[PDB]
Amino acid sequence: ARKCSLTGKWTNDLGSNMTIGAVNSRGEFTGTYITAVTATSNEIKESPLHGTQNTINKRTQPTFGFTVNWKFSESTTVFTGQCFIDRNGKEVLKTMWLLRSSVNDIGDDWKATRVGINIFTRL
Template identity: 50%
Template structure:
């Protein structure tokens, strides 16, 4: 049986909308930091590069890891949590398959129903 290819989270990633994620090296506990530069935002404010913090499940294991990270947007009162897995296709191209949940600040609890957005995003490794 062939071992599964190694997928490395560290580096720069881009989705089909042109947003860029930079993930820095994992520490021994599997946590990492980085930055997110989105091209999509429902705001008239200047879009700024925003910091992220995350963790990879089982950091020493080989293969295609699961991970999560949160982005604290610097230009709006919202936070987004991403969860996903790193995959390698048959051409050894690395991809991050993610699902994300954005929570936007609302004026009151009764408005909480309109605070969330959920979707998916696929990022490819930029070498």
């Protein structure tokens, strides 16, 4: 088995691209995220992401999570998933995400959150 590393350049079937840097010995990493599309009426810009990889038992397919701090809207996405060596020997990030929109009144909180799923593959 290889080790499934988070570090490097990734893409998805939405055509978003994301780059993750070194993971430090606390599991932290930083990177950038450029989306191809958007839920808002706003102009897209690349954005920073920050997260961690779980290092408990030093697993080769670790779980992780990261936050995308969108720099062109009031939104936040969080991703969480696992870095897998797929059947064909490629590393793949299997993720799910929550997209939280900003709402003006707490009475609209019920509808502020979308969910989805994305595979990331090495670009």
